[PDB]
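Key idea: predict the complex, not the pieces.
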Amino acid sequence: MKCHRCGSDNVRKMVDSPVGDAWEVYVCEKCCYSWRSTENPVVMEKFKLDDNKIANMGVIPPIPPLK
Amino acid sequence: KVYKDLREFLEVLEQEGQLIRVKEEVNPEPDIAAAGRAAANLGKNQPAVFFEKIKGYKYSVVTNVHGSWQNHALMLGLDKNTSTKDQFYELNRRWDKFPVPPNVVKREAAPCKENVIDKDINLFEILPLYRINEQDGGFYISKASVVTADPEYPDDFNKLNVGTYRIQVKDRDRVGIQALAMHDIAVQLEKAEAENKPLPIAITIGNNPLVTFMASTPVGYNQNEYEFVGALQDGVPMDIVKSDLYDHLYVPAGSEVVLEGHIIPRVRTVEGPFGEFPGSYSGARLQCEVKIDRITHRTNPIFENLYLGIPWTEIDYLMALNTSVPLYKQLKETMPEVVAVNAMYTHGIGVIISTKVRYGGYAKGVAFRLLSTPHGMPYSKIVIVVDEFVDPFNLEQVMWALTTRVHPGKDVSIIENCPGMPLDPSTNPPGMHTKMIIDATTPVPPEPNPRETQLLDPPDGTEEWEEKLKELLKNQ
Amino acid sequence: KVYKDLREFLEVLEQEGQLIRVKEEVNPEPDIAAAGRAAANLGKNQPAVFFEKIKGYKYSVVTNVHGSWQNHALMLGLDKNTSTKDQFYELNRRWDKFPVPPNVVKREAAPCKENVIDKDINLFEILPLYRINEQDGGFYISKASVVTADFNKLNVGTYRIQVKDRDRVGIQALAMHDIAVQLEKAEAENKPLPIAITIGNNPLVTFMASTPVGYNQNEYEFVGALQDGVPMDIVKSDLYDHLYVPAGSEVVLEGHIIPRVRTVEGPFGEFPGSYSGARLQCEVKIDRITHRTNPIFENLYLGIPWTEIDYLMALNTSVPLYKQLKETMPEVVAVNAMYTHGIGVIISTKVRYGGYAKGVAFRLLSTPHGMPYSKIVIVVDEFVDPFNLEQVMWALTTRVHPGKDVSIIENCPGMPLDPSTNPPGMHTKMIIDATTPVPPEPNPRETQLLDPPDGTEEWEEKLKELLKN
Amino acid sequence: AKVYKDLREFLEVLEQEGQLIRVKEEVNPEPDIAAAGRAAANLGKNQPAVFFEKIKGYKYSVVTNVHGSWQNHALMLGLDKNTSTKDQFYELNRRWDKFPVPPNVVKREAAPCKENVIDKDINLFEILPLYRINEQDGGFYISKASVVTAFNKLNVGTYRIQVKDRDRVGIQALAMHDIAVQLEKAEAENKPLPIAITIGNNPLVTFMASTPVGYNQNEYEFVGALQDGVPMDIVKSDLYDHLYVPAGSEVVLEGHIIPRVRTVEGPFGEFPGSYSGARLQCEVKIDRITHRTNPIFENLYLGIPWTEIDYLMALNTSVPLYKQLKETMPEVVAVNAMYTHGIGVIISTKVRYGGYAKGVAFRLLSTPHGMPYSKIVIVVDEFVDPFNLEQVMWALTTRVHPGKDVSIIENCPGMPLDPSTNPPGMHTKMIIDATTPVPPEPNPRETQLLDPPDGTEEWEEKLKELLKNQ
Ligand SMILES: [Rb+]
Ligand SMILES: [Rb+]
Ligand SMILES: [Rb+]
Ligand SMILES: [Rb+]
Ligand SMILES: [Rb+]
Ligand SMILES: [Rb+]
Ligand SMILES: [Zn+2]
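Result:
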């Protein structure tokens, strides 16, 4: 069950439905995309990510050096 | 009247006919967001929408709380049909009231301290979380009031700050946040992440509508955050209570949910995309995450969340008059002829100023002043100036003034290479503006008038007949 | 839902809370005009105001009958909270319906023929006349449907009617166009010119009388088109066999233009919001009054816009412009030409190719009405409701690069009623392209708009039904 | 009113009216035939057709510049050769909507184009004296053919044809918008798409093929309308029952677009005056050639305007624009949209009220063609002949105050074939109001024009008759 945004298999279940067995929420460990088992999300090509886009993503704000 | 929390405001809304109860159970997506969009689409008298049952969840959701001028009027304790101009004058009258220091309340007497979660923190067992827009990166908390301060100096709330920032749920006990968008936390965060220390914040959900109002206000007021809320309550202090884990952080006593946590140092993860007030999606960026160390909430809390999309939605009402009142005060300091400023359109990119024209051409001078204020300089792209008797919030009145007092050959000025804002997607070059000034005012000497007309001044007794017809209208 | 007369519309207005009854005796001035202005100043959901008692008068007055989008919606038989855009689509849908010939009813079947005043004619014993604006030259009948005329030559328009005497009124004869040749011949031969002045009407009759151009049907046939195929009842005038009036009009004034008489008429307010001048205008003698029992003087207040008169000129200006543009540009979605008889126009359209938004504006600026009238033309995208000015202002602030999206064209046709024109009667047009660029126009930064969530349309109906209960 | 049944009857009239030159001595294919076409166009006025009796290494003859003057254009319409361009415009507008004039289908035996048939060893060079039109052309080109493709859905247009083999040619498939629907299905099924390429035609046939929009009739009916009610003769093609060709065509090449075949075609000149780019385009296999005895290759030179191609696009672009303007604007007198497929337009109109001329230009700039094509729009008064560029210059120099009569509107639709567009494909429109002010526009100094002396029209007729008798 791949992540709809970046296509990674590195997906884990975030939570179960607090009431009943209605749904679950999954989350991608690579790009942090999350979705419920209810919805069938189609991610627009403009909003899809690959390792290239993630590695070249803008880091806001820059992490200062230690010490 | 004054509201101690959101529930008091919600019942006032329902009593005035500004709240709908969706009795049946709904799905998280796309029901709640589509209802928020639907309520926004009603145009006028748009109510808040209250969901009692959401599938898989145990608690409630309310949306479009601020999403109409009726709800906005009731927020300030006014009659719900109060015109936007009159709401603007009431906000301007209350803006500078001081002092009204907040009332600090014992921990037990604070309703936000009723239930405590300190282990196995799961936001989903508290908040019915859902996807606001189709292409959002995750489920978002979109109407939180986020509290920061300085640890060493409590500053007696001189350094404590409250603003609204979008909160992306990353896990059961983790959320994303836009750290650079949190001014007053920049150097506090650089120091924290340089020596690898957490930075504590408090995230309050479900508040007194004036608290969300001040939180949606970033500049323009000189009082302390909670003191400004008191100033907007016509001089009635609000109740605050110390956070459980952090001494320097104070939350409102009546919040439905309080999320106490800290920014995790040296951590950047993909946040977004999410909607922004220009009606489009932000980009996905590597932003900061917050660990949630404790949750304190009222019994059966209500997830007060906001839908935003193509304007107008609720977000526009959170930025309408709190943008316009500061600009009006800056213009008025040097131009007492200014009657009102309507800067409600895309965070003041569109501005309509009503003014008395001192002498010929004075209306463009008023625009020059706006285009030289801290906010109007880079933001304000389209500036319309109308006469003193024209309500600049009545766009039908502004249209009339445009069609009868604007000679586009001379009343319209196009000025290139001025400061701009990148969030205006039509800027070319990006971040630069070509300004447009429109002088929809009647010529006064020494400007020649091509055809002087006598306007149809309202008949005597008009104001009294307004109050008369109004009292007859509520008695139907 | 259709209405036989004004009374059927008024009772529907009261059912929807869109009518206020003033049960107490008021003074003719300034009370009635101030209530018309106050009703307009309520901004939204503005009601009609009905005065049961006016000092010195026998009968009643109603004002602001058309003075809100709620009232406009009920006039079309729609739910009162129907948006303006949907009212525009409803009007456009009915506009061309043909044939709906009117029903000529016998005289004793027409309620307007209930009472007859053939001698000692006194307008004041029928209409509670008053001064509308303080600088008016006299008391005015401001919402009358005036009939002139075979049936193809019959015309109905609304014209201001200044009361000059108990049986004499002023009229702007040149403002009536189908009478110019007939009037020159009548005054050259020193003959009267018969006209019929109707007061208190089916709201769609007044709407058609407020429409001077844009329809191909006959006057009363067009009313049948506005009623979604329901014919309206008409009846022959008492004195003039070629003049037909609505059967259920509250008051019918049968008279004639007095030949070769010019007297001081005005001043009086006009829709741009200012006083017109006093001119030597034609007078009309009233030869017969024909009225229902307990007649209702339906009159209009006008002043600084918006007032009721803006509603009588809003969508009936916009629909013909939309049809003219739609014939060659099917991408056009809606035309909002409601501002000062269409001097300000907002067009929503799909953009076929780069720059197409200005081509749409060029089309409007070359229509018979848009060419001299339309000075400010804003073009917005297909998803923007051009009747929602908040949405239009959003489009302005995010889709207008004033360095290229704003075009200023000098020495174009204008209208003298625009007081800012210099030279008078000439326009400098302003086109504003508040649309999103499409190829091959380069985009400085293309964004993805927050498309509304699935199920939004169904949730609008559900929320409305929930507010009903 | 002369109606022509083929190219020969028209070439005869041209020669009789002094509008055709015979080159009796042998010429080289290049650069003689092209240079002669360019030289004929360069003559400026009364430019004639040029007929080459002998070309080196070829058996048959070539004619060029057939449509290349207003005299030749007038004789095409059956009018006296010195009929003014304005009057030729008014005649086309009169005949444009004539309906119905259904074509007359003749039997194969009676169609001169069926005189000789070649089905095996097809060699285009044994029929057409093929030559290079311009120095950088990709090869030798058929530049004036009428291509028939398919009765209401039969279409005739002109498309450039690059000769690739003795029996193979290249064609601009996407330029034939009407074949795309069947073309995609054909290529996906590997199916030939039959076409017919006719060369050397009655001049009104080529005019209709050079007209891609603006008439409601079907192709051959429209020719009949342009012939004032005389039907034109057509004949069924030899191999394809649904394709009909003119009965009098000099040569008919029946064949098919080859599916799934894309080869480099071009460069070739285009009417803006420059070479096109060399693209991979569709190829056509010629399956049968039917031609008259002693066929005459009617080809066309194109270069820096004006050349013959400008006359094939001049008045058939103007007439539809005139009709669209006239519907709502009866004051419009004539539309001259002859310059670079209507990128430059001159309109003469009566000015109904102050500023009306700019409204007329707005209407043109919102027509389906004028909106993306027309960049420079000049409006003149009703008494100014918009086709007489001297009179237009007079209106410009005496009625244009550039501070107010000249409007420049950015970010409007444009066409990429205008190379000066920046951004490419977008236009900055220019409206020039060369009309006299009428109220309520103020006139800085009103003048009394020198209206023509009474009898001028009668004296025009008298002087022309007097000249002929000399
Ligand atoms: Rb704040
Ligand atoms: Rb002005
Ligand atoms: Rb009418
Ligand atoms: Rb634009
Ligand atoms: Rb054609
Ligand atoms: Rb001019
Ligand atoms: Zn992912």
